[PDB]
Scaffold this active site. Structure first.
Site, short mmCIF file in Angstrom:
data_model
loop_
_atom_site.label_atom_id
_atom_site.label_comp_id
_atom_site.label_asym_id
_atom_site.label_seq_id
_atom_site.Cartn_x
_atom_site.Cartn_y
_atom_site.Cartn_z
N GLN A 200 0.83 -1.20 0.00
CA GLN A 200 0.00 0.00 0.00
C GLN A 200 0.86 1.25 0.00
O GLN A 200 0.77 2.08 -0.91
CB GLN A 200 -0.95 0.02 1.20
N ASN B 233 4.16 11.70 1.80
CA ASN B 233 4.53 11.27 0.46
C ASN B 233 4.91 12.46 -0.42
O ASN B 233 5.74 12.32 -1.32
CB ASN B 233 3.38 10.48 -0.15
N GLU C 25 28.19 5.93 -9.96
CA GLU C 25 29.05 6.83 -9.21
C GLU C 25 28.54 7.03 -7.79
O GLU C 25 29.30 6.95 -6.83
CB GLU C 25 29.15 8.19 -9.91
N1 LIG Z 1 4.97 7.20 4.63
C1 LIG Z 1 3.77 6.39 4.47
N2 LIG Z 1 3.63 5.12 5.23
C2 LIG Z 1 2.40 4.30 5.07
C3 LIG Z 1 1.40 4.71 4.22
N3 LIG Z 1 0.42 3.80 4.26
C4 LIG Z 1 0.80 2.82 5.12
N4 LIG Z 1 2.03 3.14 5.61
C5 LIG Z 1 2.71 2.28 6.57
O1 LIG Z 1 2.92 0.82 5.92
C6 LIG Z 1 2.82 -0.06 6.88
C7 LIG Z 1 1.85 -1.21 6.42
O2 LIG Z 1 2.13 -1.45 5.09
P1 LIG Z 1 0.90 -1.80 4.08
O3 LIG Z 1 1.35 -1.58 2.66
O4 LIG Z 1 -0.34 -0.96 4.39
O5 LIG Z 1 0.52 -3.41 4.26
P2 LIG Z 1 0.90 -4.48 3.06
O6 LIG Z 1 2.38 -4.44 2.80
O7 LIG Z 1 0.12 -4.10 1.81
O8 LIG Z 1 0.42 -5.98 3.55
P3 LIG Z 1 -1.18 -6.26 3.78
O9 LIG Z 1 -1.73 -5.21 4.72
O10 LIG Z 1 -1.39 -7.65 4.35
O11 LIG Z 1 -1.88 -6.13 2.44
C8 LIG Z 1 2.23 0.67 8.08
O12 LIG Z 1 3.14 0.70 9.09
C9 LIG Z 1 1.95 2.11 7.59
O13 LIG Z 1 2.33 3.08 8.65
C10 LIG Z 1 1.54 6.03 3.44
O14 LIG Z 1 0.66 6.38 2.71
N5 LIG Z 1 2.72 6.84 3.58
MG LIG Z 2 -1.29 -3.91 3.29
#
Ligand SMILES: Nc1nc2c(ncn2[C@@H]2O[C@H](COP(=O)(O)OP(=O)(O)OP(=O)(O)O)[C@@H](O)[C@H]2O)c(=O)[nH]1
Ligand SMILES: [Mg+2]
Ligand SMILES: Nc1nc2c(ncn2[C@@H]2O[C@H](COP(=O)(O)OP(=O)(O)O)[C@@H](O)[C@H]2O)c(=O)[nH]1
Lengths: 41, 158, 428, 428
Positions: C11, C220, C246
Site C-alpha cells: 500500500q 509522500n 558513481e
Molecule cells: N509514509 C507512508 N507510510 C504508510 C502509508 N500507508 C501505510 N504506511 C505504513 O505501511 C505499513 C503497512 O504497510 P501496508 O502496505 O499498508 O501493508 P501491506 O504491505 O500491503 O500488507 P497487507 O496489509 O497484508 O496487504 C504501516 O506501518 C503504515 O504506517 C503512506 O501512505 N505513507
Molecule cells: Mg497492506
C-alpha cells in the site's frame, strides 16, 4: 574399489547484544507524551 | 535373526534384522595391517567383514558356489586377496566393487595359503596339490611368472 | 538511454507512487492524459508511435481497493492498464501469505511485465524499489520479488526505499516479525537500501512545516521531493552530473553496510521564507542537523563513513566546497578514521519544482543528503528487542506456521540481525 | 471480489438482521424495493460484498434467514425492508425448539441441514472470491444456539480456508432471560472454542447502560438496541466496502488480535454516542472519539476491562481525518495508563481509517478489545451451571433427546481451562 580399506570406514555461539540496545521510553521522543502512569486515562 | 513386529489392528507386518551370524566353517581370519578395529572373515560361501566394538558386520561379498580359502590383506593397507576352491585367486577392495583381478589356474585345485610381500609387489600362493607359486603384480598389469616351487604336500600356511 | 524502472509494492508502495508520479507529470509538463503540449523525460517515460508519453513503472498489490482508485482517478489515461497489477485476496499483515501462499502465483505475471518493460529500455540504470516493511504484501511480496530480480539481472542495481517500523508509531502489532523476516531477503538482494520512518517525518511536519493535521498524503509529498532531487542529474543538466553507479561506489564501503539515512533542506512553510535567505551555507548546516533526519536515529551516537549531497538550484561549486570544509572541522560530526574524505557532491541548475496545493515553498536552493553512518545500529537493535520480547511466548506464531512456514525461519532471521549488528561494531 | 455471506440464526438473529440489512441498505442508497437510488459512484464499486445483481436493477442481499417456528420471520417478511429478501433463502421448520439446546442441535436442527447447506453453497459459489462467513446468534435460546453451532461445524469443514465471524449475544449477569440459560450457554461455548475464528460477545445489560447513561434514552426498545449492534457490524466491513488511506481487511484484523488460537472472544464499542441535548456542547475531534471508545462504559459487553489486562485492541475510524492524531492518541493511552496493557507486547493496537463516515456524520469510530476480563463472563456462567447440574435439574429435557452427560462435563472442562488461559497471560 581402489584398495582403500583404510578409507572403507570413515572415522573422523551467543549471537550478541548491541550497545545502543534499549527499550523505547516515552522520553527523548518529540512525537509523543513524556510520562508513564499506572491508570491515568 | 529377525524381529517381526505384527499388529492385526491395521494388519501391518514389519520386520527388523536384529543379529546376523556366519553360516558354517569360517575358513580364514584377516586383520588389516596396523588396524585393530575391523577384521574380515572368509567362509565357505563368501567373505564377511566385521569390526571390533560391535558385531555389526559391514558387508558380505558373495560368490555363489565355490568356497573361499585363506583371505588376506595386501600389505600396508590395500586390496583383499582370496583364493578359492576353484584354483583361482581373486582380488577385491574396501567397498570391493568389482573384482580387481582373477589369477586363474593359480594352482591345480584349491589354493590353500596366500601371502603378500611387504611391498605389495608379489603374491605367494600355496596350493593343495603340493605346490607353491608367486605372481608379480604391477599397478594395473599383472605378471604371471613361472616360479613353480615344488613342495611335498598341501601348504597349510605361508 | 538514462532510464530506470520504478517499482511500487504494497500500500505505502503505491501510496508514494501517487506522490512521485504526480511530480514527474508536473515537472515535465506531462498532462494526465499522457501527452504534453528528449531525455528530459526518457528517464521515466516512453513516447509511443504518436504523442503519448506513458510512464515506465509498475503498481503491484493484492487488495484492489487501492489500485482501482488509480483506475478511477485522474491518472487513468496515463498508465498502461497492465502495469496496475492487483490481486484477489490480500496478505493480511502476515509475512508467510505474502511469501509462500499468495506471492508465488502473481510474480510469474509481474515478471513478464518487467521483461516487456526492459526490451524498449536500451541502457538501464537500475531498478527502483518503493517498499513498506511491516506488512505481508510489503515484506513478503517484496522479499519474493527481489530474489527473482537478482537471478534475472544481477548486474543491474536495485535501490531500496523501504519505510521502516518506527519506535513509537506502529499501525500494527505483528509488524516486528515480518520486519525481521525481510532482512534475510533484502540484504543479499538489494544493492543499497535507504530507510525512513513514519514517525521522524511527522515531527518534520511539526517544527518546519507547522502543519498540525498531517496525513499520509503529506509525507509522500516529501519523499517525492527526495527522488526528484536524487535523479535530477539523470534528466537535468548541471555541474557534476552524478549517475547511480558513481553514487553507489563511494558510499558503500563493504558489501554488508548499505543501510543509510536521508535528509532534506530547506523544509519551510511558504511564509517563513519571508524571514530567511536560505544560503548554501545555511542549508548544509541543517542537512546534518539531527532533527532533519527522516529516520528516528541519532547520528551523534555514531560516526560517518560517507555522505552524499545533491544540491539543486542557484548553487555554484565555490560555495559547496566551502560549506563542506567548515563541517569536517565541527566537533559534533565525527567521521570514522578510515575516510578522511566522505563527500560526493552533486549540483543541478534545475531548482526543485513545487506542486499546487503542496506545503513546501518555492525556493532556489535545496539540498538532499544521504549519509552512511554507524549510528544506524540503534533503530536496528530496537527490533532485536521487540522480536525477542514477543517471540519468547511464540505469540502469533500459529498464523505463520499455518501458511507453509516453519519455526526455523524465525531463529534464522534472528541471527542475521546479530550477524549484522556486529558489522556495525567491527568498524569501530 | 471479496464477497461475504451472512447467516441469521434464531429469533434474535432474525431480528438483529432486520436492522442490519436496513442500515447497510441505506448506506448503499438502495430502496426497500431493492433499486439503487444513491448519488455517488462510491456506493456501486463495492456493492457486491453483500448483494447480488438481478433483472431490473434490483440488489438482493446475500443473507440466509434460518429459524424454527417461522412466526418471527413473518414479522420481517412483512416489515418495511422485508420485500428485498429472496424467498428461497427463508429456511424454516414447522415445529418449535423450546429453548432447548438439545433438540435445536440434535433432532430438529439435524432435519434442516440437508436443506440449509443447499442454500449456503448456492450463494457461496456465486462469489468469485469468497472472504468469509458471519453469523448472528443468541446463546440463551435453542434455535439460535443449537442450530447455529450445528450449522458452524458443517461450515468449518466445508470451508476451512475462509473465516467465520460470530456476533453471539451472550446471557446477562443480573437478570436471567431464560431459566435453562446456563445449559444452552456452555454447550454452545464448547462449540465456539473449536469452530470459530473470531467471536464478539454482547450483552443486553450493557446495551441498556449505553442507552440509559450515554444515550440518555427514555424507552429503549429492541428496535433501538439493534440499531446499536447494526452500527458495529457495519463498522467492521467499512474497509471492505469503502476506500481509506489505511485499509484493514477482515482477516488482517484477527492476526493482529488473537495471539493464541483459543482466545477469540472480543469486546466491542462504538463512538460517538451523545444525547439529543449534548450534541450542542460536545465537539467531534479525534481526542473525543479516542477517549469514549477506550472508556469502560462503551464496552457493549458486561465485563469491566479494568479487572484485567488488554492483550490487543483495534479501532476502525471513519471520516477524512489526520492519520497522525489517530496514531499519537492510541499510543498516548498505552504508555499513559500502563497498568492495563500487557508488557510482552510492545504496541498492542491496530488502527484503521476510512474516507467515508456514516451516512449522517463526519467522524465515527468502532472498537474491538481482546481483554483478559472476558474470563468474568465465564466464571459467572461456570457457577450457575454447576449449581444446577450438581442436582440434575431440568436435565430430563436434554437427556430426553438422547444426549449424554459427559457432553455437559466436557463443556465445563473446556470452559474451566479457557478461564485459566485468561490468567497465565494476565500476570496482573
Ligand atoms: N509514509 C507512508 N507510510 C504508510 C502509508 N500507508 C501505510 N504506511 C505504513 O505501511 C505499513 C503497512 O504497510 P501496508 O502496505 O499498508 O501493508 P501491506 O504491505 O500491503 O500488507 P497487507 O496489509 O497484508 O496487504 C504501516 O506501518 C503504515 O504506517 C503512506 O501512505 N505513507
Ligand atoms: Mg497492506
Ligand atoms: N439486542 C436484542 N436481543 C434480543 C432480542 N430478543 C431476544 N433477544 C435475546 O435473545 C435471548 C433468547 O434467545 P431467543 O432468540 O429468543 O431463542 P432462539 O429462537 O432459540 O434463538 C434472550 O436472551 C433475549 O434477550 C431483541 O429484540 N434485540
Amino acid at each position: 574399489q581402489e584398495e582403500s580399506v583404510y578409507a572403507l570406514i570413515p572415522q573422523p555461539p551467543a549471537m550478541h547484544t548491541s550497545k545502543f540496545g534499549g527499550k523505547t521510553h516515552p522520553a527523548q521522543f518529540d512525537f509523543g507524551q513524556n510520562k508513564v502512569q499506572p491508570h491515568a486515562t | 535373526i529377525y524381529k517381526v513386529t505384527y499388529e492385526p489392528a491395521t494388519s501391518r507386518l514389519k520386520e527388523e534384522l536384529v543379529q546376523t551370524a556366519h553360516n558354517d566353517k569360517i575358513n580364514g581370519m584377516a586383520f588389516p595391517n596396523e588396524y585393530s578395529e575391523v577384521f574380515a572373515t572368509c567362509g565357505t560361501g563368501f567373505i564377511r567383514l566385521w569390526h571390533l566394538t560391535t558385531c555389526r558386520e559391514l558387508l558380505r561379498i558373495a560368490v555363489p558356489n565355490l568356497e573361499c580359502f585363506c583371505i588376506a590383506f595386501t600389505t600396508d593397507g590395500s586390496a583383499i586377496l582370496s583364493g578359492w576352491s576353484d584354483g583361482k585367486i581373486r582380488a577385491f577392495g574396501p567397498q570391493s566393487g568389482k573384482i580387481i583381478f582373477t589369477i586363474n589356474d593359480a594352482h591345480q585345485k584349491a589354493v590353500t595359503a596366500i601371502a603378500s610381500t611387504a611391498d605389495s609387489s608379489r603374491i605367494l600362493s600355496g596350493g593343495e596339490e603340493g605346490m607353491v607359486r608367486v605372481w608379480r603384480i604391477g599397478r594395473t598389469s599383472q605378471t604371471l611368472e613361472a616360479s613353480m616351487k615344488d613342495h611335498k604336500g598341501p601348504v597349510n600356511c605361508i | 538511454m538514462r532510464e530506470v524502472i520504478s517499482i511500487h509494492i504494497g500500500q505505502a508502495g503505491i501510496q508514494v507512487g501517487n506522490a512521485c508520479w504526480e511530480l514527474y507529470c508536473l515537472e515535465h509538463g506531462i498532462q494526465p492524459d499522457g501527452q504534453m503540449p528528449d531525455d528530459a523525460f526518457n528517464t521515466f517515460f516512453s513516447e509511443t508511435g504518436a504523442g503519448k508519453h506513458v510512464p515506465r513503472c509498475i503498481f503491484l498489490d493484492l487488495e484492489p481497493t487501492v489500485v482501482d482508485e488509480v483506475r478511477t482517478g485522474t491518472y487513468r489515461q496515463l498508465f498502461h492498464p497492465e502495469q496496475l497489477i492487483s490481486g484477489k485476496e490480500d496478505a493480511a499483515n502476515n509475512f508467510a501469505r505474502g511469501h509462500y501462499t499468495i506471492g508465488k502465483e502473481i510474480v510469474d505475471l509481474a515478471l513478464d511485465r518487467i521483461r516487456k518493460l526492459a526490451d524498449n529500455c536500451t541502457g538501464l540504470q537500475g531498478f527502483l524499489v518503493f517498499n513498506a516493511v511491516g506488512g505481508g504484501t510489503g515484506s513478503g511480496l517484496g522479499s519474493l520479488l527481489l530474489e527473482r530480480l537478482s537471478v534475472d539481472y544481477g548486474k543491474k542495481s536495485k535501490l531500496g526505499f523501504t519505510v521502516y517500523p518506527s519506535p513509537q508509531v506502529s499501525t500494527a502489532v505483528v509488524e516486528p516479525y515480518n520486519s525481521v523476516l525481510s532482512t534475510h531477503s533484502l540484504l543479499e538482494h538489494t544493492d543499497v537500501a535507504v530507510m525512513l520512518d513514519n514517525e521522524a517525518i511527522y515531527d518534520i511536519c511539526r517544527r518546519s512545516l507547522d502543519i498540525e493535521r498531517p496525513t499520509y498524503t503529506n509525507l509522500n509529498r516529501l519523499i517525492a521531493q527526495v527522488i526528484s532531487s536524487l535523479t535530477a542529474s539523470l534528466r537535468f543538466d548541471g555541474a557534476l552530473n552524478v549517475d547511480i553507479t558513481e553514487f553507489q561506489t563511494n558510499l558503500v564501503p563493504y558489501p554488508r553496510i548499505h543501510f543509510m539515512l536521508s535528509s532534506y533542506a530547506p523544509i519551510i512553510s511558504a511564509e517563513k521564507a519571508y524571514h530567511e535567505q536560505l544560503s548554501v551555507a545555511e542549508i548544509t548546516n541543517a542537512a546534518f542537523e539531527p532533527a532533519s533526519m527522516m529516520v528516528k536515529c541519532d547520528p551523534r551516537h555514531g560516526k560517518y563513513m560517507a555522505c552524499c549531497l545533491m544540491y539543486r538550484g542557484d548553487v555554484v561549486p565555490k560555495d559547496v566546497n566551502a560549506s563542506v570544509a567548515t563541517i569536517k572541522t565541527k566537533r559534533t560530526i565525527q567521521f570514522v578514521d578510515w575516510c578522511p574524505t566522505g563527500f560526493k557532491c552533486g549540483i543541478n541548475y534545475q531548482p526543485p519544482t513545487v506542486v499546487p496545493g503542496g506545503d513546501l515553498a518555492k525556493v532556489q536552493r535545496a539540498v538532499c543528503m544521504i549519509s552512511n553512518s554507524t549510528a544506524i545500529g540503534e533503530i536496528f537493535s530496537r527490533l532485536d528487542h521487540k522480536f525477542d520480547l514477543m517471540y519468547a511466548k511464540r505469540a502469533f506464531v500459529h498464523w505463520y506456521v499455518g501458511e507453509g512456514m516453519e519455526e526455523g525461519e524465525f531463529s534464522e532471521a534472528r541471527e542475521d540481525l546479530a550477524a549484522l549488528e556486529k558489522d556495525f561494531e567491527e568498524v569501530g | 471480489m471479496r464477497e461475504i455471506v451472512h447467516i441469521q440464526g434464531g429469533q434474535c438473529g432474525n431480528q438483529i438482521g432486520a436492522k442490519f440489512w436496513e442500515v447497510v441498505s441505506d448506506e448503499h442508497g438502495i430502496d426497500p424495493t431493492g433499486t439503487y437510488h444513491g448519488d455517488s459512484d462510491l456506493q456501486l464499486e463495492r456493492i457486491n460484498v453483500y448483494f447480488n445483481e438481478a433483472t431490473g436493477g434490483r440488489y438482493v442481499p446475500r443473507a440466509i434467514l434460518m429459524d424454527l417456528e417461522p412466526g418471527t420471520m413473518d414479522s420481517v417478511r412483512s416489515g418495511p425492508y422485508g420485500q428485498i429478501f429472496r424467498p428461497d433463502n427463508f429456511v424454516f421448520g414447522q415445529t418449535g425448539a423450546g429453548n432447548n439446546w438439545a433438540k435445536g442441535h440434535y433432532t430438529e436442527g439435524a432435519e434442516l441441514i440437508d436443506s440449509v447447506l443447499d442454500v449456503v453453497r448456492k450463494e457461496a459459489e456465486s462469489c468469485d472470491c469468497l472472504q468469509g462467513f458471519q453469523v448472528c446468534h443468541s446463546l440463551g435460546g435453542g434455535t439460535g444456539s443449537g442450530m447455529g453451532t450445528l450449522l458452524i461445524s458443517k461450515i468449518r469443514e466445508e470451508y476451512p480456508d475462509r473465516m467465520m465471524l460470530t456476533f453471539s449475544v451472550v446471557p446477562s449477569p443480573k437478570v436471567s432471560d431464560t431459566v435453562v440459560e446456563p445449559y444452552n450457554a456452555t454447550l454452545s461455548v464448547h462449540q465456539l472454542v473449536e469452530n470459530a475464528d473470531e467471536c464478539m460477545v454482547l450483552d443486553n445489560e450493557a446495551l441498556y447502560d449505553i442507552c440509559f447513561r450515554t444515550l440518555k434514552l427514555t424507552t429503549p426498545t429492541f428496535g433501538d438496541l439493534n440499531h446499536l449492534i447494526s452500527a458495529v457490524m457495519s463498522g467492521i466491513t467499512c474497509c471492505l466496502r469503502f476506500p481509506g488511506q489505511l485499509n484493514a481487511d477482515l482477516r488482517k484484523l484477527a492476526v493482529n488480535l488473537i495471539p493464541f488460537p483459543r482466545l477469540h472472544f472480543f469486546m466491542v464499542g462504538f463512538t460517538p454516542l451523545t444525547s439529543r441535548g449534548s450534541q450542542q456542547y460536545r465537539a467531534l475531534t479525534v481526542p473525543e472519539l479516542t477517549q469514549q471508545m477506550w472508556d469502560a462504559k462503551n464496552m457493549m459487553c458486561a465485563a469491566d476491562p479494568r479487572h484485567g489486562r488488554y492483550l490487543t485492541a483495534s479501532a476502525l475510524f471513519r471520516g477524512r481525518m489526520s492519520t497522525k492524531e489517530v496514531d499519537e492518541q492510541m499510543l498516548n493511552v498505552q504508555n499513559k495508563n500502563s497498568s492495563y496493557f500487557v508488557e510482552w507486547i510492545p504496541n498492542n493496537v491496530k488502527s484503521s481509517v476510512c474516507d467515508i463516515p456514516p451516512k449522517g456524520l463526519k467522524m465515527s469510530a468502532t472498537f474491538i478489545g481482546n481483554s483478559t476480563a472476558i474470563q468474568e463472563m465465564f466464571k459467572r456462567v461456570s457457577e450457575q451451571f454447576t449449581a444446577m447440574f450438581r442436582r440434575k435439574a431440568f436435565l430430563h429435557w436434554y437427556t430426553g433427546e438422547g444426549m449424554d452427560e459427559m457432553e455437559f462435563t466436557e463443556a465445563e472442562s473446556n470452559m474451566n481451562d479457557l478461564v485459566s488461559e485468561y490468567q497465565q497471560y494476565q500476570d496482573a
